[PDB]
Amino acid sequence: AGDRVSFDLSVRLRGQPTFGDDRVEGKEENLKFYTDEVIIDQVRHSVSAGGRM
Amino acid sequence: YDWQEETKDYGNEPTVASGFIAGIKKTRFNDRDFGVISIDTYAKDPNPNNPA
């Protein structure tokens, strides 16, 4: 049961690495995420091979 | 001695730290020492070249 479907996209990492022997703990990357949704609906139609005569 | 080891940063800079928990005092009953006689003389540096 669902009137929607939502799916996710995970972007790459971009962060200047810590060259040398300076500390790296505390500089952690965000792992940014992106998402979008598709909304579902129905479509129907009818044709009439009409008339008894 | 209570040896302890702690890694500071993701494995960088291992640290070794230790310490004892003890106390010392020269026994003083009343206001006088009990068992030590502080001989207090004049002791000059026999080698005057030392920077001191």
Minimal C-alpha gap between B3 and chain A (Å): 25
**How many whole angstroms separate alpha carbon A24 and alpha carbon B13?**
12
Cβ proximity of A3 and A39 under 8 Å: yes
- Please report, for residues A31, B28, B47, the alpha-carbon distance to residue B31 in angstroms, rounded to integers and kept in the order given: 71, 6, 39
**Closest-CA residue in chain B for A24?**
B9
Method: cryo-EM
Task: Give rounded-to-5 percent helix, strand, coil for chain B.
Answer: 0, 30, 70
**Resolution for this model in angstroms, one decimal place?**
3.7
Asked if B10 and A21 come within 8 Å (Cβ–Cβ), the reply is no
Write out the E strands in chain B.
4-9, 12-17, 28-29, 32-33
Chain A residues inside the 8 Å CB shell of B8: 23
